[PDB]
């Protein structure tokens, strides 16, 4: 559910979501990394857990629609950058 940019997870949020005590989140995240379900890193000073998730998940039609519009934004950005580069380098393009 994270916006894929604020991938850092606060320890309080994980404690509330999983109903695990403050100190249990460390072990829970460690197990998640160990079994092979997440490929991130864990920080204790800030009590935030770095998230880099490789294990995929099944999708839903609404999830597919969200992914589709996000990819539409991505492709529009790519097209805009390509057009800018092409127009700015017309002489050198050849």
Partner 1 sequence: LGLPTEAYISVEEVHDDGTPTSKTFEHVTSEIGAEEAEEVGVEHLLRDIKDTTVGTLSQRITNQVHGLKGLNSKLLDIRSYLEKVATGKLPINHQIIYQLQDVFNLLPDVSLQEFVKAFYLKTNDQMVVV
Partner 2 sequence: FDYKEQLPESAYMHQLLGLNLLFLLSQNRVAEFHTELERLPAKDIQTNVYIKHPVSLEQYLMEGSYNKVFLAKGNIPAESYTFFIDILLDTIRDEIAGCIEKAYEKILFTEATRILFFNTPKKMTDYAKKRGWVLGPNNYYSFASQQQKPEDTTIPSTELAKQVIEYARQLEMIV
> Footprint of partner 2 on this chain (CB under 8 A)?
81, 84-85, 88-89, 91-92
**CA separation for the pair 32, 9 (Å, rounded):** 14
Applying CB under 8 A, does 94 fall inside the site for partner 1? Answer: yes
Cβ-based neighbours of 28, under 8 Å, separated by 6 or more: 14, 18, 20
For residue 71, the Cα-to-chain-centroid distance in whole angstroms is: 14
Least CB distance from residue 8 to partner 2, whole Å? 16
Least CB distance from residue 57 to partner 2, whole Å? 30
Least CB distance from residue 56 to partner 2, whole Å? 30
Stretch near partner 1 under the rule CB under 8 A, chosen from 11-19, 27-35, 41-49, 76-84? 76-84
Q: Is residue 23 helix, strand or coil?
A: coil
Which is nearer to partner 1, 27 or 89 (by Cβ)?
89
Applying CB under 8 A, does 36 fall inside the site for partner 1? Answer: no
Q: What's the 3-state SS for 68-79? A: HHHHHHHHHHHH
DSSP state of 3: -
């Amino acid at each position: 559910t994270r916006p894929a940019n604020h991938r850092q997870l606060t320890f309080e949020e994980i404690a509330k979501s999983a109903k695990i005590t403050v100190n249990e989140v460390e072990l829970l995240v460690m197990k998640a990394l160990s079994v092979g379900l997440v490929k991130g890193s864990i920080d204790e000073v800030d009590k935030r857990v770095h998230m880099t998730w490789v294990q995929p998940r099944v999708l839903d039609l609404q999830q597919i629609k969200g992914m589709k519009d996000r990819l539409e934004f991505w492709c529009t950005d790519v097209k805009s950058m390509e057009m800018l580069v092409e127009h700015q380098a017309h002489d050198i393009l050849t």
